[PDB]
Amino acid sequence: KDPKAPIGVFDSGVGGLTVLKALRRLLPREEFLYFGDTARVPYGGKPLAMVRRFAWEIAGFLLRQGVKAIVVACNTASSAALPDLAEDLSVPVFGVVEPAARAARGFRKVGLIGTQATVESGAYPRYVDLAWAKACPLFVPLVEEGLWDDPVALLVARHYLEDAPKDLEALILGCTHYPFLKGAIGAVLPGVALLDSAELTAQEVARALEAEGLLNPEGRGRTFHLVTGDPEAYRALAERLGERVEAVRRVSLEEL
Amino acid sequence: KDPKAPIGVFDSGVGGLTVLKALRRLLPREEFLYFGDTARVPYGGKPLAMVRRFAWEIAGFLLRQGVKAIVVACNTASSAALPDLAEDLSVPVFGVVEPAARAARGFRKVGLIGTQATVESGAYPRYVDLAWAKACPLFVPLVEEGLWDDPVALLVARHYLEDAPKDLEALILGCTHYPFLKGAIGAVLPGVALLDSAELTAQEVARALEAEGLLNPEGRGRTFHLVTGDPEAYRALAERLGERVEAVRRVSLEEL
Amino acid sequence: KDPKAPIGVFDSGVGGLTVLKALRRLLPREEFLYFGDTARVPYGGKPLAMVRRFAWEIAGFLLRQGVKAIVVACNTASSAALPDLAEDLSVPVFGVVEPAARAARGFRKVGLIGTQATVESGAYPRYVDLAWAKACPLFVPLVEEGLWDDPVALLVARHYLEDAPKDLEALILGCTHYPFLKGAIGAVLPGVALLDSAELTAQEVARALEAEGLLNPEGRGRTFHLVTGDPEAYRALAERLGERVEAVRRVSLEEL
Amino acid sequence: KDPKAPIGVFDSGVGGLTVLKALRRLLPREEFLYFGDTARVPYGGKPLAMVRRFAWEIAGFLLRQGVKAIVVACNTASSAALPDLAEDLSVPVFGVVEPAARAARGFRKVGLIGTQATVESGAYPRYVDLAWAKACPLFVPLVEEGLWDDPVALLVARHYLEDAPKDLEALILGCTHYPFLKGAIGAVLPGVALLDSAELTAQEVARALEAEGLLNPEGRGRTFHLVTGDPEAYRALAERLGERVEAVRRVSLEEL
Q: Where does substrate bind (chains A, B, C, D)?
């Protein structure tokens, strides 16, 4: 156990940067390795079992790099791979399903939105009873196009959420990209608590790591980006989502 | 050369079905082998060289199934892989770039819409001079979500097409999915001639195969579907676009 | 923990059956999964980092079959992957390098033979001080061709072992196949103790698994064989070295 | 066609250098790209269909480097991939099976030796009627260990060619490596004509290439080596077999 060692964070691409941001705020002294698998993004439409192999390869790559814990920022990969991945690895492994589904248990009727893979996996029903679940394929490309406040978002939010229970008290945003869309989602489902996977998970990570004596007390934390697709494209994309990408290098899928 | 043998048509997923339909209308006596690489869709944001390897892998698989010709129904893969793929292979190879550009050469000011990869590839500039070109990433998810007749489609067309020159006489629909948004594109840009990649390629295919004595003068045509991801998801998506998918089988990326 | 779960054992091919037989004797009630990577055999000429990815891939595969412990029967793959693989996984992980090196420390001057990769790795010098090491590439094929009792084996043993120190007291048989060549090796190196990787490891596995309470207590144990190459070829090659294979199925490299 | 373009030659490893050497002696002004797939050597124990994907992949790679012709120096790979590879590609494609079988048709009772995959392909029987065929697995490592002049080479030659008919007039040396064993093979089978795949193929390539008007008339020939395994290990092994490797670099299997 070396608290000077970095924390691994991985995603299919830029969406998981919402998780990275929340982690860095609570843990400014830590070193993060953010792995964006942009050569194979998106996971949301791939067979769950293929994502599970992706997650295993990427966990292996992060351990090779020496991380002390792994945060699976993707909801699709969390659904596909956890809890087994945490049950198979020695370093702590954290996901974005359980923390938000835990908080959700203090409400009478809970709904879920996420990718096609996420809602069909049954990952969330394993931790919490769901009144309603619905795949929102367009949210991700709406967010990546920078249209989170544009009227089209709103109409699309209405198309996906029109048919949903009026007594829902909370809604799980079971996709890394969905925090950008609280505005259009709040507007169509007023009064409903919106559960953010990123903030809920980073808190869990911070609590658990300190509890194990693995947080780094001293020093000034940094972030390195590792992507399997084009780095310049990723840098552009990350910026459209308000993240200044400083350090990026391309990781070959042969290194996997 | 054996005219009883089938025609290979391949795409990243369901989009290339527009090409498949135009072909089946002109050549009802041909057997088609339609390959949808849904395990690795989309191509439009991947590195152009990676798509080139995809095209070569699938081209080889189709040659091992016995096809007498190959239609590359994806605009991204055509940009990535043609003309070399046709130069390197003995069977006739056709793409969806050159026929639409060729028709485009009979207007004075010509514009292009397509995927990210396509507009950046320079493939279309090779064949016709372009006044304006714009990637339309939301269009593909809009079509796959079944919303081409919804007013959000009308709004998205405006977000992408407003700031294109008023003196366009023609617009190249440089993506397999765009013939579905012909109404919305036509409304936001009245008067401009819309060039359909699928209709113009199918004609080029039929003309040339005829010229070579390769058409199958007798018998009833059949279509077989071959995909790399989940077949049942594929069939659902295909049916939302108007193809009743009769035969579908899953092909391993190990077979490539 | 679940003591009904099987034990995973993996190798590049049939060599690891020497380790499996030793395991069978000490643990007749245990259910075993033997994973033979015959699509990618042999490991001895490949880069150590490539083998290391193989070990990770297969370890992940065995975990998905539910194994409660993993034995790395290949000496080349132990050299590539241990001790990190054991440090990184929750289940007990055992190799064929450490146990023979432990026993070898009760000798004054010790030598090592094995594959090209094993000798270059420096895996063995990390556990025991070595007086001599020689790669013996032809020894593996001699065993698989069934020539271990034949004179040509004896001349080949002399060719590799001529310039070995006359005062050696022990020789590490650092390759799964080398137990078949004890006759020819002792003839060229009389009076030298031959340290058998397979016999020592099964004891360690048995001791360690007994201690963790993971030993199965009821039941007749079988072995299931999983291979990445042609199963019938594997079946025929295993029989030539004295193993009767009953259950063998081909596992695709894409499941990895 | 471009006559300044290089000729492509590929093999699993160093065995194909016998073919390269013969080629360079006949075509000293030609530029050659030698591709040795040392990350996946040997082919002889693999499923023939897997080798066939290898041939396709590497052929695509060489076409992307711009070769004007391809020589498949491996007898296993010719058996797996020819004649189809030659039918499906525009560049001239040459193998090592057909030329040696053609010369063999000038004899009454003809034998063949080679790898397990080569004799099991039945590729040689498509071109010449065979009286006798034997796989000789140990010949390849004998050559790679530098033991072709050693007496085990005489003993091993005798082991594999003992039941061979005494009325056999010719033997096809159906493996790239076996010309180094001409000495032992002729000694153990006196009076039998030995048909060398390498010398006969180069003749055919030079004949065919001049006829297509593709020879490069000006220039000093060089060879560049491309390997998928470790380049220094390859260079060492090429030096043991008498080839002086000037330029070698490693190509990733993901580039394939």
A: 11-12, 43-44, 75-76, 176-177
